[PDB]
Structure formats: C-alpha cells, structure tokens
Symmetry: C3
Subunit: 363 residues, 3 copies
C-alpha cells in the first residue's frame, strides 16, 4: 500500500505556498498597478475576500467534486470537509492533504485572474455570487475532466499545469464578464511574484521532485525568457521601442504558453513556444481586461503547441502509445473548444444570476 | 544513533527562510503602510537593526538558554556561540544547526511585532535596551517553558507554533510599552508576505515534512480564509461595508488564532477557530498598536480553542493519554496566564531600565 | 551509477527559485529606489530584458561552456541547447537539469547587478551587446575556472557561492563601465528580497540538503546580522545616527562577504567576517554605482577571510590535506587578482565593442 515520500511532501507543500503567493499578493499587485488608482483598494479587497471564499468552498465540497471519483464531468460528495480522507492517506507519492492544498491553490489563482480584472466594473456582492456559481459549475467540472480522470483525460488530453483548466477557463469567464498604468513598478513587482510562484505552479504539477519537475522547471525559465524577447522584439518593430509593460506582458505570455506543455516538451520546444506565445500575445492585445489577449490567446497557442512539441522527434517526452501527432492535435483542439464553451455558458449563467439578484454594474 | 533525513533538512531550511521573510520585509511593510509617513524610515531602520541584534543574541547565548537542558524556566550556557554542537548533530530528524536557525527565526518575528508597532514612539537606544532585556528574560524562558521541555510543556500545554511564545508574549510587551493609513497597498503587501511566510511558521513547526506538517498547512489555509470572511461579514454588519484593512486584519486574526492549534485540530476545527478569531479580532480592535487587539485577543482565543478542538471527537489528533478536555482547558488557561504575567513583568523591567538609562520618549 | 536524491532535487529546485527571486524582482527594486525616478522604468525594462537574454544564452551554449569538460579556462560545446544531457542524467546527487537551472540563476543575478547599476547611463542596445560579450568571455570562463574544474579550482581556491564568480566579477565590470534615493521603502523591499533569496544562493551552493547547507544557512543569518550592526555602529560613529540605506547596505555587505566563506567557516568566523565586511563596506562607499564600494570591497574581504577562517583551529571545516593557511591565503589572492584582471579586460572589450557599434552614452 502506497507510502508518502517526505521529499515529495516537502516539495509539494513549498510548491503550494509558491502558488498561493501568485494570488496573494502576485495577481493583486499586477492588476493593482494597471487599474485606475481610485479603484485599487476595492480591487485588493475583492481579490482578498474572493480568495478566502474559494479556499472555503474548496475544503467544504470543491476538492471532493473535482477529485472524487464520479463520472466524466464531476466527482462526488464523499469528501465534504475532507471527511473520509485519513490524515495518513497518500495520493501518488504525497499525503492527500497536500494534494488538497496544492489543487486548491490552482482554483485560487484562476479566480484571482478573473476578479482582479473585473473588480473595477463589478459590484462586490455580484462578484461573490459569480465566483460561487463559476467555481462550482466551471472550475470544478473542467478540473475534474482534465486532472480528475474525467472526459478530457480519458481521451488523452495533454495539459500539464492548466492551459485549459486555469488559463482558457479564466480568460473566457473574464471576456463574457467584460461583454456584459498609474504604478508600473507595482505591475513589475506583481509580474515578478507571479513568475517566481509559477515555478511551484509548473514544477509542482509533476506531484514529485523528479526529472519531470526538473524539466518543467527549466522549460519555465526558457519559455518565459523566450517570450520576453519575442514580445520586446515585436514591440520594438511595431512601436519603435520596448516598454516595461511590454516586458512584463511578454513574461506572462511565455508563462501561460508553457503552462500546458512544460512537463512534456524539450528545451528547444520551450524556446519555440515562448517566442510564438510572446508574439501571439502581442498580436492578441493589439487586435485591464487583457484577460484573454494574453491568457486566452497564449493559453490556446500553448495547448495546441503541446500537441506538437510533446513528440519524441522534437525533443519531447513522447506521445502515449498508439497516438500520432495528428490525433493528439485533434484532442488538444477538442479540449480547447470544450473549455471555451463550458466556461462561457457557465460564466453567462453566473453573471446573469448575479445581475438578476443584486445587479452587476457597481452602484 | 539519530540520523538526519535530507527531506526534513530541505523542508526545515526552506521553512526557516519563509519565517525570516515574515520579518524581513513582511512585518516591516505591514507597519510601514499603517504608521505615519514621517515615521516610516525610522521604523524600517529599527526593525532591521533589532532583527540583526536578535540573530546575534540568539547564536551567542539565546539558543542555548532556550533549548539547552536546564530547569523548568531556562536552559543552560553550554551552547555559547553553538559550542559543543557538532556540525553533524541531529535534533529530531534534522541537523541541529537547522533547528537553531528555525527557532531563531521565531525570536525575530516576535521582536519584529513589538518593534514595528512601537518604533514611532520609542527612542532607538531605548528599543535596543528593551529588546536585549525582553528577549533574554521573556522570550527565552517562555520558549524554554513551552518548547524546551520546561514547566508548561511538562504539564502538557498544547501550542504548536506559538500562540503563547510568540503572540500573547509580544502582545503583552507591546501593550505595557503603549501604556508607558497612508499606504494601504503596502499594508496589503506586508499582510500577503506574512501569510506566505506563515506556512513555514506553522507547517515547519512539525519539524518534518510529514502528515502533521500537511495538516498544519491545510489548517492555515482554512483558518486564515474563515477569519477573513468572519471579520468582513462583521465589518459589513457593523460598518455597512468591508474595507481592505478589515480584510488584511481578518487574515492576521485567523493566522494568529490557528497558530497554537494548527498541528492538533481537524479542518472543521480550523474553520470554527478562523471564524471566531476573525470576529474576536474585530471585537478586539473595536473595544498602530493593535499589538493585542489582534495578536493578544486572537492568541488567547486560539490557545483556549486548541484545548477544545484537539479532541478526537471533534476531528483533532486527540489529547494525550489520561487527559480530558477539561484538564486540557485548565492547562491552556494556566499557560496563557503565566505568559501574560511573565511577559508583562519583564517588559515593565525592560522599559523602565531603558527609561532610567537613556529615556524612553523619542527626543 | 549515480542516482538522484529527491530531497536534494526538491531543495535545489526551491533554491533556484529563490536565486531567480534575487534578480526578479530583488535587484530591480533595490536599484529602483536608489536611481532617479525618471530612470526607473527604463532600468526595470533593461534588467528584465537582459535577464531573459542571459537565460537564453545560458541554455543555448552558456551552461556547456561553463560546466562542460574542457581546459582550465572554458568547457566545450557538446551541450548546445542541452543536447546529449539525458533527462535522467545526475550531477552530484540531483538531476543535471536542476544544476543547469541553479547555475543559470547565478549568471542572471551577476548580470542583474551590473545592468541595474548602469541602466541609467547606458544605451539599451549597448547594454545588450555588452551583456553578450561579458557573459560569454568573462562570466562563463570564471565560472568554469572556479566551479567547472578549471584553473582556480585545480589550485584549490575556496569560493563557496561566488565571491569571485559573482561579486568581484560584477563589481569590476560595473566599475570599468562607470569609468567609460526617491524611494527608500522600495530599496528596503529589494534588500529584503535579496536577503531571503540569498539563502537559496548560499545554502543551495552545497548542492544537497546536508550539514554543509545547514552551516551555510546559519552563517548567512549570522554574517548578515553582524554586518548590519557593524555598518550601523560605524555610521553612528561617523555620522551621528544610523540610516535605512546604511542598514540595508550593511546587510548586503555581510551577505557579499559571507558568500565565498559560508560553507567553510564556523559561526564565530561568520560573526567576524560580517562585522569586518560591514565596516569595510562603509569605508568603501566613503573613500548608484557602489557596484564595488560594497560588492568589490566586501567580495575581496570575504575571499581573503575565507583563507583564514576555513581553518579547523578557528572553527572552520579545515583546509584540504597538505594546505597551510599561508598557502591558502596565497591562492585566495591569486584568485582575486585573476578575476579582477579577467573581468576588467573583458568588460573593457565589451563596452568598447558596444561603443564602436551603437554608441555607449544614452542618446
């Protein structure tokens, strides 16, 4: 019977603290320097309070519905308040309680990405309602489908750290919301914290301190760097000079782009994904609320590119047995489509429910 | 003969860096955004210099007097400058040098909590004198009594990470001192850093990356979140709206409240402790220098509640053999009382000694 | 055949994230609060973009030329884009991919130290050219000589974490460059981040979570603290009062001074090195661009003092067999001299090449 490895326990608990650091204060500071000064305090309050709400919903029923055994779309309710999970229960090579915390940290950053961007224009009570609906009906089922043995995973979708679950999912929610910089040193500080916490996000997704964690770690350094250069070169070409916001945006583009691919590609693939993601991101914001321009566009680019660069011939870990690059590409596309529609429909429902109960537009 | 486990060494060294992060720059930034602008530089200087002083006193004789074998109140002087501690000496499952650093990091945050709050009104030289007296005669004996096999531990007091040693101890010292916000984004940043470093503080108190570290980790996420919501709801009820300072204060209330309990309670207990701590904290600051309103009140609440929620029937790890909830509650109360009086008497002595030598009131 | 230890993998990946944190955003924030307000954005852009460039040059050929087997001055080109390094290859007790990332993080901070200081006065394109020349012809050969089995290591030079490779190397480059505070809370924040990341820098240099990592960890806490006090006392004596910039400068002086010595000396030696480094640093800045006043002076002091305090009789780990303190001192001096000249000559070449291609002085 499975025994926890202390080295993996240690690594995963530290990785969880790093992911929590991405929201508190990472994302808050990032949006904080971008949005209008008069809306900063309110946004920081919303991100903090909704972060708390997510942590609680996660432990009450979130983890159970996302990672319990159920069907292709959701888990079960046998782990309410983590009941029936023995303190010494092991999941993979770490204590299950660590997996609960690590996974909860991902739900938090996903919600932070949406709330930080929409805080300016949405009523507080309407954001709490939306978070509850969307975490429950979109984040949870998609996490289950992708990482909880659901539909997408059962079809062999490759998404190491959340191009779909986190990025495209939050990007679409923010976009439906939108449809319905005074402090650049602060934006830089938030970007830097997002970057450092992201090593916990990407490398921790291996669930162990092995060679895959090491690969994902190096690929994160490489893709982020390649994207910064890619964005900056494009900015210099289109605008005549680079800018700090451009440099920070490029870093996020590469981080988002490498998210689904990091544990599956070679360093060469990471370099190519980073450059393409940096340029696509720039193209994106050209054609806050760039809660798609970057996260959506780069998330899609990253997910598609994972279906290419995971190939052995291109330095990746290799596709599963009996899977050609063509089949994998098709599965990546179907996963992106399902995520976009699922999140969009649920977000619409969430916003509409808030709008019908308390009103969306801030009074 | 005991052998160090590298996984535990790794976890404990990273946890120590996280605790050091709580002071430098966590607490400094927290008070920095709260106190008057004209006093910020001076306060940051005092926190930095006194942090250095504590690190040195700790290695010179602090660790030895707190953790050496002595009597019920203090250790010994056989570990001056860590003499007689072989580099390869193991304490528990890690190298003793790691335990020296981890424990020293706790002395630093405790002193940071007091200095950051009083810097505005106290003379520099008077704070150095006070720190020396209080670290030596209050922090050290209380650490010894609680974690160094002294009086309180010998009576079975439950205090996982320092409700008494750190929180009530610093709260009372700050209060005796008091008796004798221009930058809210900065307060938020300090709160966020305190939060992230606190995982090292609470989970590292297990001394190993096991299921107790995992439990303390999850309980920290849960209590902090429950307290944020608790404080915010109370604020909305009493004041009509939440505020950023309220959200940050709630987070600290839950973090302080869960400190003594984190490695002993179940997640349900963490949720209850967090809510009660958030509300008590709000009540507290209602009826800087809230270096009691929160740390004192929440520290007492947390310590008392540890005597309840540690029970097996309430999802805790269970009280020691032959100990009823009633007996445990009595021991918690006696530990709180002893800490309050011990710190108060020593703080009085420290402040008076400074006042008689250089004068307390800043010139 | 060598097997990776997961505890060491975990420790080294977290230590690498901590070193990356030193540059992004550590050094950027430090210089950010020091330089003129009108130059902050541009400097943050330069540090971010050059950080990206270093990460890419490192993976493309940097790691191979620095750590591949070659001659006394450089490695080889058999590891271009990390080709021929099996994902499961082990170096020491960790996966080689982790060593690539850890070592790359050191190249980044070294370049960050120079760029952050010179950004104000140097043209963007000229800094990119200089970085490429200097990383390639100075950082790489010196890293190889000291940590890649080259000339200095072959002569028994003691430099645990980079007094020569990082500190004196960057100090001289910045000085040749120079030859050719509006936000003190921000300087403090950057200092604090540099401090916390420095535990990854120093303790991670052991390459494993053992007693040497533990020793280096404690020595870092002690030297930093001793230097803060040393600088502050000197400042109080010369200037009548301490200052925040003085406190922060002292911390960096001790951190730099203990860099080459941390894994070789006893705590007493760390205390002595910290005090001497704090005072020397103060003397230094007395007789930004203090990219020598502190890093150069303290780096030299630290390197010389490592040749003294590594001795068993003074509490150190002991010199290698057949090596007297006299011989060691001579080797330390020769290593310092070689680094100063090598970096100076290459920096001159780098700046001149930029000056002849695009012009150095910002337009």
């Amino acid at each position: 019977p499975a025994v926890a490895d202390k080295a993996d326990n240690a690594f995963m608990m530290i990785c969880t603290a790093l992911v929590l650091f991405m929201t508190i204060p990472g994302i808050a500071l990032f949006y904080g320097g971008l949005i209008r000064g008069k809306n900063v305090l309110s946004m920081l309050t919303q991100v903090t309070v909704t972060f708390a709400l997510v942590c609680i919903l996660w432990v009450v029923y979130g983890y159970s519905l996302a990672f319990g055994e159920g069907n292709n779309f959701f888990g079960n309710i046998n782990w309410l308040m983590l009941k029936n999970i023995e303190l010494t229960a092991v999941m993979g090579s770490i204590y299950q309680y660590i997996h609960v915390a690590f996974q909860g940290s991902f739900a938090c950053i996903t919600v932070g990405l949406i709330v930080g961007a929409l805080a300016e224009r949405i009523r507080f009570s309407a954001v709490l309602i939306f978070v509850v609906v969307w975490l429950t009906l979109s984040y949870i089922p998609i996490a289950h489908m992708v990482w909880g043995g659901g539909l997408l995973a059962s079809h062999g979708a490759l998404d190491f750290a959340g191009g779909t679950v986190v990025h495209i999912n939050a990007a679409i929610a923010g976009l439906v919301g939108a449809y319905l910089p005074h402090n650049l040193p602060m934006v830089f500080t938030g970007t830097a914290i997002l970057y450092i916490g992201w090593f916990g996000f990407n490398a921790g997704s291996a669930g162990t301190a092995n060679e895959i964690a090491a690969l994902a770690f190096v690929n994160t350094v490489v893709a982020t760097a390649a994207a910064i250069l890619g964005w900056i070169f494009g900015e210099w070409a289109l605008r005549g000079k680079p800018s700090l916001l451009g440099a920070c945006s490029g870093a996020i583009a590469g981080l988002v782009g490498v998210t689904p691919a990091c544990g599956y590609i070679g360093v060469g693939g990471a370099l190519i994904i980073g450059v393409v993601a940096g340029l696509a991101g720039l193209w994106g914001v050209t054609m806050p609320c760039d809660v798609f321009g970057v996260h959506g566009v780069c998330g899609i680019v990253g997910c598609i590119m994972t279906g290419i660069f995971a190939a052995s011939s291109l330095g990746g870990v290799g596709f599963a047995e009996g899977v050609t690059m063509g089949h994998q590409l098709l599965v990546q596309l179907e996963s992106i489509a399902i995520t976009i529609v699922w999140s969009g429909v649920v977000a619409f429902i969430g916003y509409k429910l808030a709008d019908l109960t308390v009103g969306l537009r801030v009074p």
